[PDB]
Design a protein around this ligand. Structure first.
Ligand SMILES: NC(=O)C1=CN([C@@H]2O[C@H](COP(=O)(O)OP(=O)(O)OC[C@H]3O[C@@H](n4cnc5c(N)ncnc54)[C@H](OP(=O)(O)O)[C@@H]3O)[C@@H](O)[C@H]2O)C=CC1
Ligand SMILES: CCc1nc(N)nc(N)c1C#CCc1cccc(-c2cncnc2)c1
Ligand SMILES: [Cl-]
Ligand SMILES: [Cl-]
Ligand SMILES: [Cl-]
Ligand SMILES: [Cl-]
Ligand SMILES: [Cl-]
Ligand SMILES: [Mg+2]
Ligand SMILES: [Mg+2]
Ligand SMILES: [Mg+2]
Length: 186
């Protein structure tokens, strides 16, 4: 693996979570964007790998676990085996990436997508090498108990436009949001 992707939706006050769910009501097209980005693989015969924290895993409805069309990996320092339905378990992002180089996963994984939560994003965003951050800016404040840290512009640059990503402000259920893409190379 020579690149990593993070994907997140964040409120104006840096919120990503509230009481084990999203702080905002469901945005259907925003979710489909999340599906499309994480699921779409450019290589026939391979699937993308999604990496998530334990709480995020259990935030997904049982009937939708594991995430279809993707290899589901859960991070935990406490679990000794993957939770029911999950394909893999690792104690760290580095361990997870290494696992991709093992016989089981060799030639099976295309892109790697980190889908939260907070601590998973923090580790991933400091990981060396090329990294893209797909950040949906929900353009209003929402009550939250889980947050996304401000992006270090010393490392990351906001890309002005991007292929496959809409640039204009979007609106669903009266809520305005915008798709952003950040990138670092080192
Ligand atoms: N808006 C968005 O884009 C998203 C929102 N969310 C929301 O956020 C909330 C959940 O996120 P959050 O509270 O941050 O919880 P997490 O999903 O990050 O789960 C935390 C647990 O995951 C394990 N873990 C996390 N980071 C690491 C790491 N770096 N290395 C090894 N293990 C790790 C640890 O498990 P252990 O205790 O077993 O060691 C930790 O206790 C939910 O409400 C969810 O809806 C989540 C993803 C995206
Ligand atoms: C709409 C959620 C979203 N948008 C973007 N741009 N990035 C994200 N990381 C997220 C998110 C989230 C939480 C999450 C993570 C993984 C799976 C799911 C999920 C929730 N409900 C049904 N299927 C999957 C929910
Ligand atoms: Cl759509
Ligand atoms: Cl999905
Ligand atoms: Cl390819
Ligand atoms: Cl428009
Ligand atoms: Cl609307
Ligand atoms: Mg733009
Ligand atoms: Mg606009
Ligand atoms: Mg548009």
């Amino acid at each position: 693996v020579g690149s990593l992707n993070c994907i997140v939706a964040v409120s104006q006050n840096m919120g990503i979570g509230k009481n084990g769910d999203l702080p905002w009501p469901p945005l259907r097209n925003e979710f489909r964007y999340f599906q499309r980005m994480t699921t779409t693989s450019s290589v026939e015969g391979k699937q993308n790998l999604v990496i998530m924290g334990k709480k995020t895993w259990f935030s997904i409805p049982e009937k939708n676990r594991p995430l279809k069309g993707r290899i589901n990996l859960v991070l935990s320092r406490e679990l000794k085996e993957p939770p029911q339905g999950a394909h893999f378990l690792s104690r760290s992002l580095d361990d997870a990436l290494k696992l991709t180089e093992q016989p089981e996963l060799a030639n099976k994984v295309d892109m790697v997508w980190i889908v939260g939560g907070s601590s998973v994003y923090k580790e991933a965003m400091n990981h060396p090498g090329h990294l893209k951050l797909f950040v949906t800016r929900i353009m209003q404040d929402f009550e939250s108990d889980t947050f996304f840290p401000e992006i270090d512009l010393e490392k990351y640059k906001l890309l002005p436009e991007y292929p496959g990503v809409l640039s204009d402000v979007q609106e669903e259920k009266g809520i305005k949001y915008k798709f952003e893409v950040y990138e670092k190379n080192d």
